[PDB]
């Protein structure tokens, strides 16, 4: 072929907060300096749209480029499950590339958020693992953050969502904290944001008591 094309959905937090701008992003890699003309056409359920923006060409070691279009979308469009197509049209590729992206079809389902304390056995360590289970939610698009005493706690990782036996999703998030802090008796909180939550937002707390 020649080049290569990727299409990314908006950040889960950006479709849930009217304060923010969600975007669909088209990324095209391995575009030839011999004819670096890339054309983008954006479609929202067929209908062409001319509000996209293409960040200027950007080259790597190989002097092959990487060009990115950014289609800002409406929260409610995405969430009502509209479809975003990008027609990418280079020279190198025999025929233009058509990719489509959209939210997952199916009745939305509310997450159940449960925090779990460290295992007894883990207490022999210096750092301990504060756990949060998010279960039974649909679709998978979700945000998850941690905080304590009105400040972000950033030393966590969250698993990808996992398809459950009932066709919902679950994940776990894991915040790591010096056993000192857990043991004094401070309070930690897991914020979850999902379309199926009232206020697109819920929170659950966890402490040594």
């Amino acid at each position: 072929g020649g080049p290569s094309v990727f299409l990314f959905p908006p950040k889960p937090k950006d479709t849930l907060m009217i304060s923010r701008t969600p975007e669909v992003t088209c990324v095209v890699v391995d575009v030839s300096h011999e004819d670096p003309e890339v054309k983008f056409n954006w479609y929202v359920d067929g209908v062409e749209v001319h509000n996209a923006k293409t960040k200027p060409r950007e080259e790597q070691y190989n002097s092959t480029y990487r060009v990115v279009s950014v289609l800002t979308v409406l929260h409610q469009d995405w969430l009502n499950g509209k479809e975003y197509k990008c027609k990418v049209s280079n020279k190198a590729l025999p025929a233009p590339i058509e990719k489509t992206i959209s939210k997952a079809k199916g009745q939305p389902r509310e997450p159940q958020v449960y925090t779990l304390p460290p295992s007894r056995d883990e207490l022999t360590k210096n750092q301990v693992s504060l756990t949060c289970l998010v279960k039974g939610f649909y679709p998978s698009d979700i945000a998850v953050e941690w905080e304590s005493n009105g400040q972000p706690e950033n030393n966590y990782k969250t698993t990808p969502p996992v398809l459950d036996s009932d066709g919902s999703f679950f994940l776990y998030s894991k915040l790591t904290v010096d056993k000192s802090r857990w043991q004094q008796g401070n309070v930690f909180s897991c914020s979850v944001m999902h379309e199926a939550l009232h206020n697109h937002y819920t929170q659950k707390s966890l402490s040594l008591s």
Binding site: L16, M17, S19, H75, Q76, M193, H200
Partner: protein, 69 residues
């Protein structure tokens, strides 16, 4: 008691109206309060000038500026 406060707004020139309880997020842009809502299963957005915004919508907005972030 527990009211049903409705927020009146304009959509494509049509004068829509939505209950507060169907509103998932609110935000302010100047004198202009935006809000995302979920009406019986479809998602929609809506504007209102702050002057035309009920107390409860502004309460929601404040609560969100505190909480969501």
């Amino acid at each position: 008691d527990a009211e049903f406060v409705k927020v009146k707004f304009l959509l494509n020139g049509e004068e829509k109206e939505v209950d507060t309880s169907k509103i998932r997020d609110v935000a302010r842009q100047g004198k202009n309060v935006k809000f995302l809502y979920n009406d019986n299963g479809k998602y929609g957005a809506g504007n209102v000038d702050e002057k035309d915004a009920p107390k409860e919508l502004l309460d929601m907005l404040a609560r969100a500026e505190r909480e969501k972030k």
